[PDB]
Amino acid sequence: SQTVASHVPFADLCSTLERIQKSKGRAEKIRHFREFLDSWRKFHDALHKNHKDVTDSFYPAMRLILPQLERERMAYGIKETMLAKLYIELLNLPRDGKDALKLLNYGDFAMIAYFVLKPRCLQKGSLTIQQVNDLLDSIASNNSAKRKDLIKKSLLQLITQSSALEQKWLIRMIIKDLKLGVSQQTIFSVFHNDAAELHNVTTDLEKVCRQLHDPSVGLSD
């Protein structure tokens, strides 16, 4: 019943992505990712120590790290132009104001929002990776259900309880373009030797994460 994702602050995922994006070289980008992956695997073993048929895996993080491969969640229905409006309303921005204009007259959108949010209010987030996923789930469902009001509420929960850095990264997760500077093939290859292969055949991110959870146990076993 318990999940590693329920114990990991979204902020630690985001600070990892930030250091990855910020690294110049491939080796450094890999090192930041590997560190988070390795901790996740150590914690998984401590958490699920004496448990039976465990289905928990790295999927709740991996689906945020490779969001373009997201298949379980339907489309979010979220455009950068409407996030702009959501922030102007939420932050009580005057539309003649400098921050409002930056958002309206839209180095992606995530970065603009980031510069706007950085000097403001909340500096430390509270959400776990699981809670972020549960909320992205509501957003996707409510897009299918054609409930734009419930989408705004869920998004508002995600945004208001998160730091600027988390919001930058959340935005990129929703748009499905992290701009990390490391390929999907590289990410898969750090995770597991066989992961790129398994994903080719299954097109199934959760299956890959769960079946190849143990780096020393290959597809052939």
Partner: peptide, 10 residues
């Protein structure tokens, strides 16, 4: 016996 994430990463 519940592990704290902070002694694994944070």
């Amino acid at each position: 016996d519940v592990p704290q994430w902070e002694v694994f990463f944070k």
